[PDB]
Each structure stands twice: as structure tokens, then as C-alpha cells.
Amino acid sequence: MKLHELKPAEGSRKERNRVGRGVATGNGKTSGRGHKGQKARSGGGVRPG
Amino acid sequence: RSAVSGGGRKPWKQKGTGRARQGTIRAPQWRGGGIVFGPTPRSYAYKMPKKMRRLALRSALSFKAQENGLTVVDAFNFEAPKTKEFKNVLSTLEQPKKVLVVTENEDVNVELSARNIPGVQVTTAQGLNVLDITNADSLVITEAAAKKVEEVLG
Amino acid sequence: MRQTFMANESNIERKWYVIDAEGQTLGRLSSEVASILRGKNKVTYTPHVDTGDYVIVINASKIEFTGNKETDKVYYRHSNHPGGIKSITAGELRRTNPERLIENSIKGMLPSTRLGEKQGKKLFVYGGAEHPHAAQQPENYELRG
Amino acid sequence: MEAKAVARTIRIAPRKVRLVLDLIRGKNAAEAIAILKLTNKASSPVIEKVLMSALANAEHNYDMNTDELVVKEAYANEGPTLKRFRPRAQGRASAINKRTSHITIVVSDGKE
Amino acid sequence: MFAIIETGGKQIKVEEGQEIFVEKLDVNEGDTFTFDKVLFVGGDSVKVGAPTVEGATVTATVNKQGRGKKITVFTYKRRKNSKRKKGHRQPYTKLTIDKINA
Amino acid sequence: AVPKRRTSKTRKNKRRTHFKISVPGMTECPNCGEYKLSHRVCKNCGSY
Amino acid sequence: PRVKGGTVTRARRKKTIKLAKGYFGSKHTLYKVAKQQVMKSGQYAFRDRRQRKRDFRKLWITRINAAARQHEMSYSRLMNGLKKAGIDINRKMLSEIAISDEKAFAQLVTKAKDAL
RNA sequence: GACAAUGGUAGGAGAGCGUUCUAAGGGCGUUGAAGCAUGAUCGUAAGGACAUGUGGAGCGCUUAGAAGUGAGAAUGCCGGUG
RNA sequence: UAACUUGGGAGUCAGAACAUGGGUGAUAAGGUCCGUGUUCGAAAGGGAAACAGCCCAGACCACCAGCUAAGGUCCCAAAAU
RNA sequence: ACCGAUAGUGAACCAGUACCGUGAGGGAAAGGUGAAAAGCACCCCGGAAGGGGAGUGAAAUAGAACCUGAAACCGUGUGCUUACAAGUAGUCAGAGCCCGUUAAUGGGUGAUGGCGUGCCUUUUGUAGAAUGAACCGGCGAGUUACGAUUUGAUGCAAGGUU
């Protein structure tokens, strides 16, 4: 190819979900966590099993 | 927070001053610092399977062949390094601004006579990679390097 | 916003009417007069300017009250002072200031906006059949059924 | 033609100087001197010193007739403040703003 | 001398000579558009349409295939993190009546 | 004790419309000098 | 690399201050109070585009009702008989005949009146 | 061309817009870059231009990379200013 | 016109009022606890004067077009003195 | 594909320094004239500061607080409005009076009418008399490494891989 016309393969690359950036992304305020409880805190949740 | 200097002192007391709960002078909302998730020194390199490296290098110089940017010549015979002479070599045979000369073993006089022209790069046949093949507009391989890249890439 | 006639100054002509009020019940007289003042009898009616014309009510002391609401139907009034509630019956307003009896019936059928206060200013109610406004040249208007 | 003078960083506060400065504007240059000599505000010897300076820049630099001039503009802008503190009670300081002013009067005869 | 044409989904009170704004027809500029649905002709002689006047076209020349002024459609909910903002230019046609019929 | 709301720029400027100052006496001294304050004897730059 | 908050915060906030021109005092200068008023006014503009279609049909019926009582008709009996005539004219066009051409309105009154 | 769908919070999915940097290509600039200010411009949106001032040196665009990438709220922090 | 199976990702375990079947209480509660619906929650629009839960009715966006539902038609204030 | 002066060392500046503490200890803020100082000779007002000229310079609203100078805030002017009016400050509808554009079924103002109890966070439910914000500006929060599992993509395949 050329270094100014190179493009990735189709389906190879997605952009990642930045979470916690504004209302319209759907992951804005509470950031996919829901409101309260142990799962909504940083480092929270509980161990597998 | 753990790396900025100072800030072990809790700056005021927890209840009863009328001000917000702050815990150190160096918390990340303070001006003095403490960065939350910034750069860490990491390594960005990764690897492919090594059948996928041969194929990426064959596809980079078949794109040169199919668009006729492959000019095989005989041996370069430079006794002394002379940039003025090598620039005339790239003009007697017509070449674009970016060119990539390739020899079999390391020719010390070609690699010095082309070292100063902007756009030209000298490479051993063993040292071909995808990013100077696809950067150049045209290859100029030799006889001894064309047979050498043919043996190791196939 | 294609094409709707919106009335204006230099576009409306307000005339003068006289309503004889003898032998008329209060709020049937008052409701017909309230739509002459606002302009709803006009085809060039706009709600935001004062189309609508002048009404003189000339008898006003010969007003019918059906039922028992000349001893009943107290009119209340508070003075914005503690225990300053004050009352007068409808019959006691008919014999004493019958002009304010009618022009509070009609002004209560008008809106309380800045335009409804100036549309109520076009009403001139007189107890007893003589009005001063012969210069303004009003016409007779018969109330509709 | 107009003639102006300014007085930058005058330690009188801008609110206190705009009182007397509203008395003289629009008025002719002779009677504006007489108002600033008779009001007993602190600013009255300071605007008068600036009104003297702009009538002098009219006669000297622009060769105007200083007998017939009128005060067009008479305003005072804010300058940089000096932020002082003040110990009140129970270890509790409170800020005092030493305000400054840029006093500007311009004078003209209304002709071009 | 006076007509009510029906065009778009609505009715326009037309006189001959004036510039009228209709929802977008499928003609180009500079053409001549004839209106097929006249409901009332008045002026001197008054022809009331039965639903229509059974004939009585209105020809008009076409000026300015255009887009309207942009309106911004913003609706939000009061505490719930939900809003939507969108813009709208509505297409129009600027015809000009030049000949009436009855 | 404390203001429940801030006063606006409009309400502040409506309050201080009577926060003004008057022009003084300004009578001429007919003997000599500039304008003196009315019913006052001059001290400097005048003969009252 | 570090990207700092340069020049994109003002450009988003200036076009809300500029969009709030003509508001009382603080509500056209400060960002937090003009943003809330522009959100409020876009909600009002959506709402009142839907009510302008109600408040003009309300205006036309009041004028047809006042023009039909000059011919001893109600609004209700007029457009009953004007539908029995087959007339498919609006409330808007009928309100503009009645102001402009008074005889042409009276001639479709006597087509609705004998349709009953 | 028909037909159908399109309120929406936790939340799931999709497609985008801007930001700084890199690579390659192609560019623009004292005949005035970026900023800044103003405007009645364009796009469905985040946004994009243009013009004119100011400003006195840089900065776009295309494609693809990387992220300290987007603020109105935390009795947030630091500045000013009421 | 769905359903089911497998897999990736979830949020919720404080509900509310009406109507109705009940317990409890006092055939008391805008009470409480269940069965059953609907609505709100998460649903703006119209009506119930105002009025999350009632009544009608689900908003892709323009329109100064028409018919209608609950409700209404003297005046406020559209339409039957 | 590190930072650009609230960043980056606390510290780009006569920093562990002013400053604070009895003491250990805690600990700042503060970069930018111009190419060149050519850093305003003289004149005027003033006690001086300051100004107004003149002059230097490409530029002096580049004058030593000196590159650009944004908002909050403070002013001075104005075009249209306003002293019978009950207001979440708009929004549609609109006369009047001004004005002339990135010229397009324009711009400013608003007599009057209709509608209309801020925003977050919390909640069964908030105009809420529940919480948070004086305003403006900057800063300020799902990252990285390693492993695991899933898809997507691409190798080549009974093998694939270092």
C-alpha cells in the first residue's frame, strides 16, 4: 500500500467505549453501574463464587 | 497521589469547619497535584506469527513489482564514497524522489554515497522490512540481492 | 404563517351602543354586554388588541333578580385588615348604587389582564334613563336570544 | 478637536470619585472648576487637578480657546486594588479592598 | 379575480399577481404549474365549488425551489438524563399566480 | 441577618438613584475673585 | 500525550451565550443560567409550535361565528349545512372571505341555509 | 415504488462529531499563521465554514495511528470578581 | 406472530395510587399485608380549576389543513342562551 | 506519538526560600519589552505622581505591571422601550418605531394577547419549604500491566506457535 492510503481490514478495529462522558453516550452519569450498592463503588463488587 | 511530595497531614478536621471534606493537600482535585490515570512507562511492541511476516514482506514488494517500481540492476561499483556521483546514478536511470537501494551484503561505499540525499535509503537484502519498502516509491535491487531475497522469501 | 387578518390601529372602528336594562335579569344582560366589549361580535376579532365597542347601560335600577337573591346573594369584600370582611345584599346594591351592581357583574365576566381592564373601561352604566353621551352618538342595541 | 488627560491609580475608590464627577460633566470648562472647588468631597482636589491638566493640553498642544470649552467625557475606571487584611475577632482576618481609580476627563469646543 | 386553491394538504387564498409559498411540488424553477383543485371563485361573479368548480384552473409560474429557516427541535426531560436536539429546514416552493379562471 | 438572595445589577442601581450629590451655592464675589460659596466669606482667590 | 482544555470550552459556551440574547440581566451573560433558559425555551418552542395550530383554529371559529350571526345563523348550524352542501373549505379560508368579500360570504351562507 | 416502524429512566447495541500528538501524502502563511472579537452562513446533532477587525508566527487538509480526549454541578481545588 | 436453545453484556431485590378479591385494624386511615388488573414509575398531549397514579389518548419532524375521543357549547374561555 | 508555567521536581524565577510551628515538622506564590534599549532628548500641566505633545521603533492601546489580553465585574455613550402594574423572565402571536445582511419568504426593539411553578442529585413521589452551586476562568473521575474468557479480524490447518 501507501503510508497515506493504508486502511485496516474490515471488522478488525472497533473504538472502545469511553464511559462517563456526557449524557448522550448512554454511559454518562452512573457509568454502566446502576445507582447504589456494593457493585457501584470503585473496587466494589465481590469475589467470584 | 503516592508520588507527589508532601501531603500526609489531613489539611483540616473532618467535621465542623464549614468546608468540604479534604484528606490531603495532594489529592487529585487539588492544584498541587496527584494525577489519576496518566501515562505509565510501558512497551508498545507486539508480535505476529512468523508466517505472517514473510507474507507481509512478499506483499510489500509484489506491490512494487505490479506497479513497476522494481528496477533490478547489476552490481554497484563504487570505490570511494561520492554523493555527487550516486545522485547522477539515480538520474541516468529515472527514479522518483524516494528510492530504496538494496544490495546483497553490506556495501560500505553505496551506504555512504546515498546517506546524505533526502529520500534515498540503502538496505541489506537481509535487512528488508515492510516500512521502508512501502515508504519508497521504487526499489533498485542488484543481481546479488534479487537472488538473495528470492531464496529467503520463498 | 400564510394569511390571517390581524387587526390594528387605523384598522378598527369602535362605535357606541345603548342597552335599555329595564326588565332584564342581571347575568343574562351582563353576559351579552360582556361580548360587545371584548369584540366577539366583530368579524375582525383579534385577541391581542382592543377590537370591540362601547356600551351604555341606561336604566340599571330596574334589574330583575329571579328567585330569592335580592335578600340572598350577598356581595363580599375584604379590606385587607384583620376581620375586615364586609357584605351587602344584592337588593341593597340595587337601591343604593345600582351602577356598581351591574358594572361588577360585567367586569367579572371579562378577563383580569391588562386588556380586560381597559375593555371594562369602555362600559358606562347609568341608573335612570339619562346618559350624558349624546355627543358620542350611540345606537340602540336589542339583546339576542 | 478634543483634549484629554488621565490620572492613573488614584487611591480614591471608583464609587467615591464618580459622585462628584457626575456633577461636572456636560458643563462648560469655567463652571466645572467652580463646582470642584466648592464640593467638600475628597475627590474634588483630584478631578480639579485633572481638569486643569486637560485645559492645559488644549491651550498648549492643540491651541484651543480655553475660554469656550465644555467637558464632554468625565469618567473614572477601576484600577488595580491593594488587597489588605484586617484582624477582627477570634483569629479571623477579613479582607479590605484599597481600591484605585483611573480618572479621565476630556474637554472640547464641539467643533471639527 | 379571486380564488381559493387547494395545494399541499391545505388551502391558499390566491389573487393574480402575488407570490405564494406552498409545500414542495415536483417541478423545477421557471416552469408553469397549473392548480387543479379550485374550491371557490369570487370577486365579481361568485362560483361556489360543489366540492370543486369543475374546471377553473389556476396557472402559476414557479420561482425559487427553496429550504426554509432552520428550527432547532430541542426537548429535554426535567431530571432524567434524556434530551434530543435536532434541526429542521422545511422545503417550500414560491409560485406566482399570473392567470385566474372560473 | 444575611441576604437570602443576591441583589442583581438592576436592583442595586434602582436603590442608589437617590445616592447622589448636589451642586453647591456658587455665587460670584463682586469685589474680586472666583465663585464663592453662598452666604460665605472667601479665604483664598477672592475678596469676600 | 497531554491534551489540555484549550479553546473548545469557550466555543461551546459562547454559542449558548449568543443564543440567549435579549434575556434579563444575568440570563444573557452567565453560562449556567443562560444554558438553562435556552433548554427551557427550546422546550417552549416545541410546545408552542403545536399550540399555534390550536390557537389559530380557535381564532378562525370566533370570526366565522361572528360573521354568521349577522345572517341569523350559529357557527354550529352554519358548518352543519355547509357540509350538507358539500363545501370543503377551511375554517381559515372561510374566516378570510368573511373579512374581505362580504357578499361572497353571504352567498355561501344561503347555500348552507337551504341545505337544511 | 409501495408498506411498516420511530415516547422513554437503570441498561444493552450501533453510527458519529470535536480535541492533542504521530506517520505518510498534499498544502497554507509578514501580500499576516494560531489565537481573540463580531456577523443576518452551512450541516439532522455533536459541529463546520466564510467575511471583517485584532493579532504578529506558525497552522491546516487527506488517510491511518496513538491517547493525560470533551464538565455545570462533587458544602470540589486554585485564581480573579461581585 | 412469535417461540425456543446457546452465548456476550446488563440494571433492579425501597415501589406508588386507583379499581377489585381478601386478611389485619375499628365493614379507621393517603394504614398495612396478599390475589388481580390498569396507570405512574420510565409517558409528554386533552379533560378532572390547580392536581405523578383518575378519564381519554402513546409525541420521527415541518403546516396559519380536516375528522374525532374523554369531555363540553351564556361570559371568563372553542363550540347549542 | 514526555511536560509546556494551575503542566512538568516543592522549586523554569537569588526554594526546602518567604511564611507557619516551642519543637520535630509543614511548606508556597511568582517565566515572556523589542530584532536591537534604540528604555521616550525637549515642551506643557502638576508639589510629586501622573498625563498631553514631541521623539525612538515595523509597531509605544510593544513604555518596563511592558507578547497576545477571554469571561466574571466596573463604566461612559446611545437606537427602541418603560411610572395601573402580580412577573421560573421565556415562548409562540403580534401593531408600532428604528436599521440594512455571509440578501434571505432580513436585523434591533416590543403596545398587547395566549401558554408557561429553574437545573442537578436523590427518590413511590420534588415547583419543592430535601441536597448542591455567589459568579466567571482553569483544573478536576473506568486507566495500565499481567492473566482469563468471549466475540471480531487475519494467518495455515491436522496441525498451529515460538
UniProtKB/Swiss-Prot annotation, chain B:
Region of interest called Disordered, as start-end residue ranges on this chain: 1-23
GO molecular function: rRNA binding; structural constituent of ribosome
Keywords: Ribonucleoprotein, Ribosomal protein, RNA-binding, rRNA-binding
Biological processes, Gene Ontology terms: translation
Record carries keyword RNA-binding: yes
Keyword Ribonucleoprotein attached: yes
GO cellular component: ribonucleoprotein complex; ribosome
UniProt subunit comment: Part of the 50S ribosomal subunit.
Task performed by this protein: One of the primary rRNA binding proteins, this protein initially binds near the 5'-end of the 23S rRNA. It is important during the early stages of 50S assembly. It makes multiple contacts with different domains of the 23S rRNA in the assembled 50S subunit and ribosome.
Family the entry assigns: Belongs to the universal ribosomal protein uL4 family.
Entry protein name: Large ribosomal subunit protein uL4
Organism lineage: Bacteria, Bacillati, Bacillota, Bacilli, Bacillales
Gene name as annotated: rplD
From Swiss-Prot, chain C:
Keyword tags: Ribonucleoprotein, Ribosomal protein
Pfam families in the record: Ribosomal_L13
Entry GO CC: cytosolic large ribosomal subunit
Family, per entry: Belongs to the universal ribosomal protein uL13 family.
An example molecular function term from Gene Ontology annotations: structural constituent of ribosome
Source taxon at top rank: Bacteria
Xref: NCBIfam families: rplM_bact
Record bears the keyword Disulfide bond: no
Function statement: This protein is one of the early assembly proteins of the 50S ribosomal subunit, although it is not seen to bind rRNA by itself. It is important during the early stages of 50S assembly.
Family annotation (PROSITE patterns): RIBOSOMAL_L13 (PS00783)
Gene (name only): rplM
Disulfide bonds: none
Keyword presence, Magnesium: no
UniProt-listed PANTHER family: LARGE RIBOSOMAL SUBUNIT PROTEIN UL13M, RIBOSOMAL PROTEIN L13
HAMAP family (alphabetical): Ribosomal_uL13
Gene3D superfamilies in alphabetical order: Ribosomal protein L13
SUBUNIT field: Part of the 50S ribosomal subunit.
InterPro entries assigned to the protein according to its UniProt record, in alphabetical order: Ribosomal_uL13, Ribosomal_uL13_bac-type, Ribosomal_uL13_CS, Ribosomal_uL13_sf
GO biological process: negative regulation of translation; translation
Full protein name: Large ribosomal subunit protein uL13
From Swiss-Prot, chain D:
InterPro entries the UniProt entry points to: Ribosomal_uL22, Ribosomal_uL22_bac/chlpt-type, Ribosomal_uL22_bac/org-type, Ribosomal_uL22_CS, Ribosomal_uL22_sf
Pfam families registered for this protein in UniProt: Ribosomal_L22
Keyword rRNA-binding recorded: yes
Highest taxon above the source species: Bacteria
Residues of the signal peptide: none
GO biological process, one term: translation
CC per GO annotation: cytosolic large ribosomal subunit
Keywords from the UniProt entry: Ribonucleoprotein, Ribosomal protein, RNA-binding, rRNA-binding
Family matches, as PROSITE patterns: RIBOSOMAL_L22
Entries under Gene3D superfamilies matching the protein: Ribosomal protein L22/L17 (3.90.470.10)
SUPFAM superfamilies (UniProt xref): Ribosomal protein L22
Molecular-function GO terms, alphabetical: rRNA binding; structural constituent of ribosome
Biological role: This protein binds specifically to 23S rRNA; its binding is stimulated by other ribosomal proteins, e.g. L4, L17, and L20. It is important during the early stages of 50S assembly. It makes multiple contacts with different domains of the 23S rRNA in the assembled 50S subunit and ribosome.
NCBIfam families on file: rplV_bact
Family stated for the protein in its record: Belongs to the universal ribosomal protein uL22 family.
Self-association state and partner proteins as the record states: Part of the 50S ribosomal subunit.
Protein name: Large ribosomal subunit protein uL22
Gene of this entry: rplV
From Swiss-Prot, chain E:
One GO process term, biological-process aspect: translation
Compositional bias ranges of the Basic residues kind: 80-91
Repressor as UniProt keyword: no
Molecular function in Gene Ontology: rRNA binding; structural constituent of ribosome
Protein keywords: Ribonucleoprotein, Ribosomal protein, RNA-binding, rRNA-binding
GO cellular component terms, A-Z: cytoplasm; ribonucleoprotein complex; ribosome
Region annotation (Disordered) ranges: 80-102
Family designation: Belongs to the bacterial ribosomal protein bL21 family.
NCBIfam families listed in its UniProt record: L21
Primary role: This protein binds to 23S rRNA in the presence of protein L20.
Subunit annotation: Part of the 50S ribosomal subunit. Contacts protein L20.
Protein name per UniProt: Large ribosomal subunit protein bL21
Lineage of the organism: Bacteria, Bacillati, Bacillota, Bacilli, Bacillales
Gene transcribed to yield this protein: rplU
